[PDB]
Amino acid sequence: SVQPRTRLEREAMKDKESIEKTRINQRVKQLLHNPDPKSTLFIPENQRFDKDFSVFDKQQRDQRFATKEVALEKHRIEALERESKRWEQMENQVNKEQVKRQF
Amino acid sequence: MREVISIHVGQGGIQVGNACWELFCLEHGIQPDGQMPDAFNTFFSETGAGKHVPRAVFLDLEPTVIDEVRTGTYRQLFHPEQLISGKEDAANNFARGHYTIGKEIVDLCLDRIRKLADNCTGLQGFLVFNSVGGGTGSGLGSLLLERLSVDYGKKSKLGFTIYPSPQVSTAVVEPYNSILSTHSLLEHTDVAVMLDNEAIYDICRRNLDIERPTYTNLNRLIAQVISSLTASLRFDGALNVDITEFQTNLVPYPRIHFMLSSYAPIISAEKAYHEQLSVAEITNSAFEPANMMAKCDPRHGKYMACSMMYRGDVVPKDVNASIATIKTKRTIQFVDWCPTGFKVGINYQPPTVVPGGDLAKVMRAVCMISNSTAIAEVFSRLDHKFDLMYAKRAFVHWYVGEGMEEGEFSEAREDLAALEKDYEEVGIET
Amino acid sequence: MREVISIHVGQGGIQVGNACWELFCLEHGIQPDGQMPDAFNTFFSETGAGKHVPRAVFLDLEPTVIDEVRTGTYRQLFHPEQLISGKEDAANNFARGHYTIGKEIVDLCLDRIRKLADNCTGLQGFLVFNSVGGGTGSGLGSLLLERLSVDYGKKSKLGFTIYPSPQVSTAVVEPYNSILSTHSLLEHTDVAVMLDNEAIYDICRRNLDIERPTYTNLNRLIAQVISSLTASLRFDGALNVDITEFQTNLVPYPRIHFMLSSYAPIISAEKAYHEQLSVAEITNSAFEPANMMAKCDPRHGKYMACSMMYRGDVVPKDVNASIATIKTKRTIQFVDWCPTGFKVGINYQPPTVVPGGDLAKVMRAVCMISNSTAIAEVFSRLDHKFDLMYAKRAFVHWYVGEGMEEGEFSEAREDLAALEKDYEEVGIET
Amino acid sequence: MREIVHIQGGQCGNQIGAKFWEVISDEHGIDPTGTYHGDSDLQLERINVYYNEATGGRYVPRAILMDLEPGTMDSVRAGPFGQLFRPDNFVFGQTGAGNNWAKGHYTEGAELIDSVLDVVRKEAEGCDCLQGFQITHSLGGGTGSGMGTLLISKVREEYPDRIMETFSVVPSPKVSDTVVEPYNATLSVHQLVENADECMVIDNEALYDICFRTLKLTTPTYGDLNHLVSAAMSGVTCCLRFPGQLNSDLRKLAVNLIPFPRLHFFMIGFAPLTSRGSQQYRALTVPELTQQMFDAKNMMCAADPRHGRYLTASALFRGRMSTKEVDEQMLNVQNKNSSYFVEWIPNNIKSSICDIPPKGLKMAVTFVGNSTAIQEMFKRVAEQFTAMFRRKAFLHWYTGEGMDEMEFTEAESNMNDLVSEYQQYQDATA
Ligand SMILES: Nc1nc2c(ncn2[C@@H]2O[C@H](COP(=O)(O)OP(=O)(O)OP(=O)(O)O)[C@@H](O)[C@H]2O)c(=O)[nH]1
Ligand SMILES: Nc1nc2c(ncn2[C@@H]2O[C@H](COP(=O)(O)OP(=O)(O)OP(=O)(O)O)[C@@H](O)[C@H]2O)c(=O)[nH]1
Ligand SMILES: Nc1nc2c(ncn2[C@@H]2O[C@H](COP(=O)(O)OP(=O)(O)O)[C@@H](O)[C@H]2O)c(=O)[nH]1
Ligand SMILES: [Mg+2]
Ligand SMILES: [Mg+2]
């Protein structure tokens, strides 16, 4: 929905050269055992011993599914919002025509 | 599951790549550090936790621009070892970057391309950017295109080349390597878009009202055109267009794939909101000869096919009502064997604004990619410039001594003559 | 869905355009910034949200007046790039503004005209204003009319030209370009209205009681006449009149379309309210020879057709009762082949007052546009002035050296002789 | 019993289905979660026509969605009523066709179609008594017009006795969005005549004309065109899902509307259609429905039905009404227009009555007429095809994937033969 405010808000344009002015204004290594905390690679020493891909994968899989579900509800709502505005506008148009006629 | 890889080679290529990569990061909400504070997948890749890595590679033999990139605010974004850099510049010599120093660098670039391609699963195609009037740019672009055409085969490659202006020029030897590079990419690139600087200078002067533009202002407009072209792959739209759906609609014959672009509207915030920017007026402005992005006159030739993209809140019926008006006008005439020549795309996402830039925020925009018969004039004038110095064999010793043969200049001339004859043969009515 | 476009060229044209554009903005409630704090559509266009843009274009080769416009209070109203300005003035030379410097500017004006016309859907016609006794005004008016007559064809164009006074003159060479411009617009304009300054000076002196008038006082009266003429298109009325309903009522023959205007009442607030301003007395004052807006005597010739507009609370029966009285008088006689010669229009909106101006607020007004046989005197006296200097070929070298041929002066003289013979041939009874 | 399965292909077909299934679900009171919440008993008696039953009491459409790119089906899933579709029925490729018919019919569409044919066979073998299939696709796209038509032949080869429906959108020359539309339209019409039992042409231009003139809404969108097409689609099979005075399945229409096996291209229309502001003025009566039903502007095609003579006609009235009035009105519409009805087949109008009206309307009519006026669409399509083919424009894209020009020549010849033999009966007399 492209949109602008009133003429007063922009207030820069009556023969402005400010834009011209702005241009003038500009004138034994141990990194294997020590990957950074930020990196993906670093697994905590304490957790070094969970040995089951099974349990871990199931929890991970469940989480990976859930994000997609919330995302779907949100994107559909955006779809609904464009359509709602159009429906509303057509109805609005009829009301408005009506309003001017009554005026 | 749709991806595209962009290749940036040469100083102009890197400087326009920077311009497009601020815009993409801004449009997808990614901070300059690469961290967000499912549409990103076309240009980026997820690392598992946190940052995003662009699907782009920067090439240059001269290290200054890459070093500038690796120290700016975007130092954390790009992968450290995909900014391939050389030591010695080609120095505007085409033979250098095709035979002497480019060969030792091209292998690393091809290894990086393979490492990026194995990650993608739905690779749509490649994008490449290179200023033609330079040694390393033209030479390495030619060599990379020639290697890719055989390594991958039928994958689509798009070239956003910047040809020299009719009279304005920065070098003195750029016609030679421009002609040679046109020879090289004539039989190797699927799409080539014209981008000479003089037309964009005139656009900035007339519309943006800037009397002292620099290269950044030009590159921002080019970045906006790229974003408009590739918006349909990463945003929902009523009438989508894919990259592979081009050679079936804009390329009548395999030889003819040079076309020139235009964009509308181009207007500053100081006087943008005083007028309504209807779809009819913007689609009229896009077809104005003075708003061509390449300094060519469309009134001097026929049209072959027009592919033009909209984005914003445009409604298809308003688009049809404006295509009819253009078909009505007597100053725009299409070729006889093409009854309908328009391909229309509509997208919902409005163009994004870059802070501190020139363009204002608007709800409607149009980008056209048009193939016309009038493009032969740039080839004719480049050929005339080439012949003047090739008559006396000037500057040839700088090329013969870099491994290139004497006869290599003549066959490029013959291919340009063939192209000019083909453009004349196509434009005659039956 | 009814529109009209006004063209202002030359210093006098721009200075009367300013005068009419304060009045229209005041009459439709639009502030000087262009913002309102469905009748506007005739002169304005809606931008979607907020401001209104006039359907007018300002032309001049000499930049002083346009620069004055672009810095006054109305800087925000007009679109920045429809105030076309040149660099070098024509300097009262007609050949300059028709052959030398006007040709390079006329293309931009025609592009602006097209861009304004594509927006309108119900275009009634064009209005043009130009002081005849100047180089750029007459020359560019002639060239624009000649281009428009072939670009659009049957669309109606109205010309509010200001001819020089019988004896009062500001230049010394204005008869030459006046005659040439009359030649040019004789076969190219549908309506021409006489506006010489001396008659309006006398009107101001006698009625407004101003002993030192300036050009603004004259231009305000002209603006009021324009508003009275075009009121019927944007206000409800019991008896409407359109622009296209003129050549069927005031123009007996294609050659004869020069007519002279009058307005009533003209009175100041200091003594306006002491008298009742009935319709009979105002319609009597409008027909007084001393209240003609051009310095011509209607008692010296017949009438052909009278089109006269009312506005306010006037009732048609009172209008008929006053037309009968005028038909009764023995000092006003119509031509034999015209039994009825009056076209009457009635509108409800009273004339609007401009603050700080001369005219007061009244509920009734009358504006007449009358075509009469007596207009030939101005042509005869201009011809006599022209012949005196053309006998010795004075000032001709200033025109021959600007590309105009020697014989171009003679054919304008022949066309004026033809017009004078035609006016005599029409006025004789059968 | 006597149920049908839904198969759609391409982006246009997917968007049509996304509204068709919403309309059907709203008609039967099915929530977007698959749970019945209807009011009337009749809403569940014949729900097996379109919906299957699963554990937990929810209903799932028996629709099959196919495309060569995943974007459109990844987008339709997030829309309303998108969860009803079974995830197993979604089949897609990773490459796409790029509006190239050869790629979507020879190289890429051939390998993928086995998976979709597997699920199609699963759906058809299981159902109680098959009635047939209905197909929605567009002739203006590559993947759709290729894969859908090849699937038509594959289905026909395995079920020769079942009935086959196709709702086909043909590219009009007025609103053109793709330059290569004539090629894949002409290639598709060749295969479509040989296998489809019924075909119903729909044009975007006619939909825009209807929306602008009858409904008089300011800004049409694809949602309105889809809604009109969906209402027309639902109207055909209404009496097969609801009781009525004269039930008439699809096979009964096939018997009565197709005189010869190659003349099965109909154009349709829906009534009533009224604007929002005039929905209170009008009164719904059988004469009012039948006068709008035969109106030329009401047809869903730009073809002008008074440029030819109807071979036969059909009407499917909805709501509770007297049959005597329907029959007398059908007789009256045939006596007053005897010039536009072919004379060697008397009583060529079929009528049917269904007692269940659409939700929100008291009466509705669906019109399906076989007329000779449809020749004009094939004429213009072939005209554009032969204008583009004579220069072999864009031919290399098709010929690079195993296709040749001989199949183009045969397609053109067969299409012209169809055009000729369709009008052969227009001039036939008894
Ligand atoms: N549009 C645009 N063109 C540029 C820009 N920078 C350089 N060029 C063009 O590039 C041409 C020369 O090639 P460059 O890109 O500058 O240099 P190069 O391609 O790296 O080749 P070398 O000289 O060997 O380094 C000039 O004629 C310029 O017109 C830029 O920032 N924007
Ligand atoms: N009524 C009226 N007449 C004017 C006005 N200004 C100039 N004129 C007349 O215009 C005539 C000369 O033409 P100008 O309009 O002044 O100048 P121009 O038309 O721009 O032509 P150039 O001299 O080439 O610039 C003079 O004889 C004046 O009588 C004005 O404000 N009101
Ligand atoms: N009614 C309707 N038509 C559409 C829609 N989207 C596209 N079209 C039409 O489909 C044509 C393009 O078909 P295309 O998308 O290329 O089909 P595909 O190749 O199978 O994907 C255009 O000419 C449009 O008129 C829609 O949402 N509704
Ligand atoms: Mg460099
Ligand atoms: Mg002047």
PDB file of C-alpha atoms and ligand atoms in Angstrom, chain C residues 11 60 62 89 136, ligand 5:
ATOM      1  CA  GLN C  11       5.227  38.369 -20.155  1.00  0.00           C
ATOM      2  CA  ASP C  60       8.529  32.322 -21.795  1.00  0.00           C
ATOM      3  CA  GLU C  62      13.032  35.369 -20.760  1.00  0.00           C
ATOM      4  CA  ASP C  89      14.623  36.591 -25.127  1.00  0.00           C
ATOM      5  CA  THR C 136       8.130  35.739 -28.041  1.00  0.00           C
TER       6      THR C 136
HETATM    7 MG    MG E   5       9.497  39.621 -22.394  1.00  0.00          MG
END
